[PDB]
């Protein structure tokens, strides 16, 4: 669950 996939990024 990387940041690039998160809703924030």
CSV table of N, CA and C in Angstrom, one decimal:
chain,number,residue,atom,x,y,z
A,1,UNK,N,0.8,-1.2,0.0
A,1,UNK,CA,0.0,0.0,0.0
A,1,UNK,C,0.9,1.3,0.0
A,2,UNK,N,1.5,1.5,-1.1
A,2,UNK,CA,2.4,2.7,-1.3
A,2,UNK,C,1.6,4.0,-1.3
A,3,UNK,N,2.3,5.1,-1.2
A,3,UNK,CA,1.7,6.5,-1.2
A,3,UNK,C,1.1,6.9,-2.6
A,4,UNK,N,1.8,6.3,-3.6
A,4,UNK,CA,1.3,6.6,-5.0
A,4,UNK,C,-0.1,6.1,-5.2
A,5,UNK,N,-0.5,5.1,-4.5
A,5,UNK,CA,-1.8,4.5,-4.6
A,5,UNK,C,-2.8,5.1,-3.7
A,6,UNK,N,-2.4,5.6,-2.6
A,6,UNK,CA,-3.2,6.2,-1.6
A,6,UNK,C,-4.0,7.4,-2.2
A,7,UNK,N,-5.1,7.8,-1.6
A,7,UNK,CA,-6.0,8.9,-2.0
A,7,UNK,C,-5.3,10.2,-1.9
A,8,UNK,N,-4.3,10.3,-1.0
A,8,UNK,CA,-3.6,11.5,-0.8
A,8,UNK,C,-2.6,11.8,-1.9
A,9,UNK,N,-2.2,10.8,-2.6
A,9,UNK,CA,-1.2,10.9,-3.7
A,9,UNK,C,-1.5,9.9,-4.8
